[PDB]
């Protein structure tokens, strides 16, 4: 995995996660309303992942939630036709929870990954320099 590889630049590791979030597919034979109703449980689960310290899965899942209600679901064949009482509360939740939480998780992931990347590169540098010294000696 890209996101797990400490040698990979922190920005690419985070992008791999948001890419996985974006991959969510809309089933055109599920009524749009079911997606809106499911939003509550998706939010609950993303919160639980975060509280477990599973910030990668929390970040992926907020990205899915956002991708769904912002990008994919409005393209559903029955979307424009659908009467969705939940839409207002979903907009509110996107603003209150999903966006700011995902943004905060992004910052946290970047920070952790940067620490890992820095420490790794420092170790590998010292090792590579040692090898370069030894290849000179011989």
């Amino acid at each position: 995995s890209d996101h797990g590889d400490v040698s990979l630049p922190p920005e690419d590791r985070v992008r791999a996660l948001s890419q996985l979030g974006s991959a969510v597919e809309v089933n055109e034979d599920i009524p749009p309303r079911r997606y809106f109703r499911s939003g509550v449980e998706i939010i609950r689960m993303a919160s639980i992942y975060s509280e477990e310290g599973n910030i990668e899965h929390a970040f992926i899942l907020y990205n899915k939630y956002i991708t769904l209600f912002i990008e994919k679901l409005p393209k559903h064949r029955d979307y424009k036709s659908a009467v969705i009482p939940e839409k207002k509360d979903t907009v509110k939740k996107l603003k209150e929870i999903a966006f700011p939480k995902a943004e905060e998780l992004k910052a946290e992931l970047l920070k952790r990954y940067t620490k890992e990347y820095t420490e790794y590169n420092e170790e590998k540098k010292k090792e590579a320099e040692e090898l370069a010294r030894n290849m000179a000696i011989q």
């Binding site: 992008r15 948001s18 890419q19 974006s22 990205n63 956002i66 991708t67 209600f69 912002i70 990008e71 409005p74 839409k87 207002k88 907009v91 996107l94 966006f99 995902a102 943004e103 992004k106």
Partner: peptide, 20 residues
């Protein structure tokens, strides 16, 4: 309803930033 669609559309750029 117009105002909700309009709110969703205004978050497109913010999603773009999230994915950056």
């Amino acid at each position: 309803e117009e105002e909700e669609e309009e709110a969703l559309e205004a978050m497109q750029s913010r999603l773009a930033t999230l994915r950056s």
